[PDB]
Amino acid sequence: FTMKYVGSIDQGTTSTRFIIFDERQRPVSVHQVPHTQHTPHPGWLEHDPMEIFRSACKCMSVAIAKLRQKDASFRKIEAIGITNQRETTVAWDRVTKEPLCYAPVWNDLRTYDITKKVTAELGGGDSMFASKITGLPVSTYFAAFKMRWMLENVPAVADACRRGTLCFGTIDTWLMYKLSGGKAFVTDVTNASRTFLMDLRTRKWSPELCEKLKIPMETLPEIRSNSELFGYVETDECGVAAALNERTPIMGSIGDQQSALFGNMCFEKGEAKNTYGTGCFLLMNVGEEARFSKHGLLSTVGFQVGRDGPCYYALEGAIACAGATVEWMRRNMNLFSHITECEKLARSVPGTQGIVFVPAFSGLLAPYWDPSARGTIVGMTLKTTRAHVIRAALQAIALQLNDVVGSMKRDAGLNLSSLRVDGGLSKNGLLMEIQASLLGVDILVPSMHETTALGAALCAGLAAGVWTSLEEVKAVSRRENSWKTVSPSGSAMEREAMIAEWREALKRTKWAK
Amino acid sequence: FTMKYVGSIDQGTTSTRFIIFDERQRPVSVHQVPHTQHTPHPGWLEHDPMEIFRSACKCMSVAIAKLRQKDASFRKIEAIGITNQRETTVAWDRVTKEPLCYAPVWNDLRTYDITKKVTAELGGGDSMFASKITGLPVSTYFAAFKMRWMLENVPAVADACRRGTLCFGTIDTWLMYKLSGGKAFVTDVTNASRTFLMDLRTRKWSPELCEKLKIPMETLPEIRSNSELFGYVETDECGVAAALNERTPIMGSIGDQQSALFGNMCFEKGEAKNTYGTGCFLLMNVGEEARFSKHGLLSTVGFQVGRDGPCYYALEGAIACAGATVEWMRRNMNLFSHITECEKLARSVPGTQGIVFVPAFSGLLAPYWDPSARGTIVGMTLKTTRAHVIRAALQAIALQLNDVVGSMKRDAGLNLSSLRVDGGLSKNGLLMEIQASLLGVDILVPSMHETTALGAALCAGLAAGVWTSLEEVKAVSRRENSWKTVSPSGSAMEREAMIAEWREALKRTKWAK
Numbered sequence A, B: 001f002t003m004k005y006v007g008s009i010d011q012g013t014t015s016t017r018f019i020i021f022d023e024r025q026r027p028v029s030v031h032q033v034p035h036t037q038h039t040p041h042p043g044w045l046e047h048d049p050m051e052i053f054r055s056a057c058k059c060m061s062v063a064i065a066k067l068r069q070k071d072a073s074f075r076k077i078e079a080i081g082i083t084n085q086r087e088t089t090v091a092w093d094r095v096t097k098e099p100l101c102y103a104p105v106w107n108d109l110r111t112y113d114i115t116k117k118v119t120a121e122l123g124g125g126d127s128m129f130a131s132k133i134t135g136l137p138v139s140t141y142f143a144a145f146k147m148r149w150m151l152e153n154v155p156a157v158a159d160a161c162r163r164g165t166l167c168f169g170t171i172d173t174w175l176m177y178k179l180s181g182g183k184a185f186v187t188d189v190t191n192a193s194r195t196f197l198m199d200l201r202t203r204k205w206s207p208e209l210c211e212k213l214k215i216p217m218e219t220l221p222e223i224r225s226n227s228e229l230f231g232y233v234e235t236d237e238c239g240v241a242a243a244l245n246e247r248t249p250i251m252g253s254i255g256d257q258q259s260a261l262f263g264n265m266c267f268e269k270g271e272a273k274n275t276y277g278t279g280c281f282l283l284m285n286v287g288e289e290a291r292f293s294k295h296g297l298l299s300t301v302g303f304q305v306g307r308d309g310p311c312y313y314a315l316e317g318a319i320a321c322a323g324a325t326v327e328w329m330r331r332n333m334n335l336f337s338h339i340t341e342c343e344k345l346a347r348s349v350p351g352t353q354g355i356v357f358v359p360a361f362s363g364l365l366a367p368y369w370d371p372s373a374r375g376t377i378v379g380m381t382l383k384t385t386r387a388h389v390i391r392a393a394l395q396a397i398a399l400q401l402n403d404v405v406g407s408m409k410r411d412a413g414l415n416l417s418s419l420r421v422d423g424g425l426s427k428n429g430l431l432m433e434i435q436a437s438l439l440g441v442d443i444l445v446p447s448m449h450e451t452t453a454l455g456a457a458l459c460a461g462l463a464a465g466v467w468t469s470l471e472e473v474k475a476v477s478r479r480e481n482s483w484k485t486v487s488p489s490g491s492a493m494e495r496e497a498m499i500a501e502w503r504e505a506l507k508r509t510k511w512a513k
């Protein structure tokens, strides 16, 4: 009979995408719509919630139209999954169905003042004071502090709060709310874990933290798993309820990085995913028992398939400048013109030969949180060329991830089994070879470019019966979607010497204000 | 009354050049002939003395032939001045009139083993043991150690020493010897001050230093001033005498850096010159009393006009990578296509916005000696561009000079009156402006920049009576050749910030070994 299709909304920081998958886990139809990156002040970033909603709607109707062209028997989508940029918080009124203000992005720094105040007055100076509850440090990124800011600075948000019509929610909630025409007010365990308001292990809202951070629990949605019935697409914007035909259940919701972990089949303990973009996030599945960090890392939910399915937890490490570093060498420094020359020049030299380039342009994150760190090159002679500098940048990305991986291994008591990588820099062959040799792990690069989107589609498809088990999911994946493997090709001393050289260079990165 | 002309032989590390000046101090003819750069062993550099002499004669006959084509008033050259690469030492036989080997160049490093031996055995671990006598530390550069190497390693030189036919001479002596047809064996006070054999206070050879270093006084020439009769040109090697037509006296001899000091009219104490070339050589007139450094700067003779005349001393400082940095950014780093873009890109930004680039590619010299220092960049953000790196390099050159100048001012017990500039990077308007703001003195840019050649021509012309006083020399210069004056135009906090950043960066430069 006809193919079963699963649709995935991939709502990213810069754009929204709807991707329709079939039973082969193959992306058969795609549409993308970008949205506005509002920066009203320095360090501020916010998105127009209604623009994001309309973008998703357009993506759906266009992708549906394109598929019916390829398959005329395509009448319905079995279920829809959502995957989203995390932490970004929307504030809306439950009567007008409208947002009270623009949504502060995960990246936004406006919450700095509140962040300081929380650590000092509630944490007594310790930013890790609630880390055994949330798995998180006090930071500008997490949803709670953005909520507090909107209560303190936006009169309309406080007006909705004082009346009792205020709703707070991350992008998954907002989308599910508007897609349902105001009928659903829900969130998944992964998104909820990024709010600073959820107990990580019990996966329930914490009244202790909600009251301390002055957030009314009346403004918070219901927490569900990643794979179950969330609601139904009940909106004719932009003709989506029509474009859909059979009434379509929303059955998947999962944070973007977690969706990548899931979509790359990282089901076992020690299986990890590094998602490349401007920076990169590294997530490792640490098993069913939550692991807490002594070395800067985040403790988060990996995935939970079903209301009482096993919850797999993860450790998370972020480094800020990856793809941005390679482009920096291009648009800012003129080291190359085409991004194909980047690897060509880097491979044209036997080594860095004395130099180390620490591309800490936005400070040191990884495990060693040092906001004073800056971009720095040491050890240069007159024999130093752009080729050695580019290769040093590639070595640096590898060494930075090694610092994260090392920290993850110690925090989890678990070796990195294998590493999946996708995104802009996963194409760079030399970077992969250096990373594989330095980490001592196999690097798997998916030939299918839509593994982030696939995660939410897998969550929905499992809930909708398109796929019946993770073992079937894995079997279909192996049959349909190939991958390149990059194995270690370096020596033991070659690694130790490179790290020792790296450690010496880090000492000189401090620059500060 | 007829037009008067003075010739200048400029014998450098890479080429020889004859420049004819008229009485207006205008360069009216020039020809350049290179000589072979012999590098038999790594770090070694050697010059064929007969090739250098042949080149000098070739340069003279061609430049003269060129002049009479375009100048009907040119009849003869009144006098010839010589200016030469210092320290480079020639060993020749007094009977064959030919060298026994090639001449080790000033930057040649074959004398390292001997230089460590002198510091150990004669100095007692102190390389400054004869600094109060010579003004120099024990170093590979200076002639005495090259002479010693020739007696230890070259059998012909050791053999000539036995018979009493061996002559040691710096380039001024070798040329003066061969030009005269073996009739003159003399050196000027500036060139002699670079042998490690002259006493600064007496301006004579030190019997004790000759005794200690086993260099017989039979091998050394007679020390004279920079301006007087040395001899006559009595050779027709490349048709030179014929070109000269009339008999021509050699009336000027001065080391290349001192010649720039003289060419730039630094006749008064407090007046300084800097040659912005591949590296920087800073010379400051310290007066009629020798001033000694505690910052590793060299004490030397600046000039002496006339037999036993007033002897003005100098302090000398150098930086390794000035022009070499600008070129390095172009070829090795692709920061710009060719020379003109360096200034334009650097000017396009108001400042360096936090970054510091310390181009210590071959260590730090000046008042902070550190061979372990390497090329370093600190403070980079994603806002940093190639333009910022270029401007930072220019700032770094100026900052290094500021440190050298400061150290000179303290030891000499005098303020910097003004800085005259030449070399090539003096054409960079922004570099001059930054330099002026950092120093707090006006910077003088001669529109006639053949200043090194001018010094020897002035020396010869003063002895020949073409110019009758230093006061008239300046008057002619002021009337005929226009100066560009660059006044300090910075902010107290901007200079304060630039120096403070520079200071921090220097601490992060240690790397080598």
Ligand SMILES: Nc1ncnc2c1ncn2[C@@H]1O[C@H](COP(=O)(O)OP(=O)(O)O)[C@@H](O)[C@H]1O
Residues within 6 Å of the ligand: A003, A022, A026, A027, A028, A070, A071
């Ligand atoms: N082996 C297959 N079995 C069933 N349907 C398929 C198969 N291959 C392609 N299709 C269908 O053909 C349409 C076009 O997809 P296409 O771009 O060819 O997919 P792919 O490139 O992944 O094979 C889609 O609707 C897809 O479901």
Ligand SMILES: Nc1ncnc2c1ncn2[C@@H]1O[C@H](COP(=O)(O)OP(=O)(O)O)[C@@H](O)[C@H]1O
Residues within 6 Å of the ligand: A024, A479, A480
């Ligand atoms: N139910 C199925 N749907 C699609 N392909 C299947 C199925 N069962 C087995 N296969 C096999 O999986 C392989 C992948 O097919 P397909 O995705 O069409 O390849 P392509 O990359 O050319 O699109 C084929 O060799 C096919 O025989």
Ligand SMILES: Nc1ncnc2c1ncn2[C@@H]1O[C@H](COP(=O)(O)OP(=O)(O)O)[C@@H](O)[C@H]1O
Residues within 6 Å of the ligand: B011, B012, B013, B014, B015, B016, B085, B275, B276, B277, B278, B279, B281, B323, B423, B424
């Ligand atoms: N001390 C110096 N004086 C003048 N130019 C120098 C010096 N050192 C390096 N240079 C560079 O060499 C070029 C010409 O100098 P030149 O006198 O021909 O060198 P050399 O002394 O080796 O013959 C200039 O463009 C300049 O950048």
Ligand SMILES: [Mg+2]
Residues within 6 Å of the ligand: none
């Ligand atoms: Mg196909």
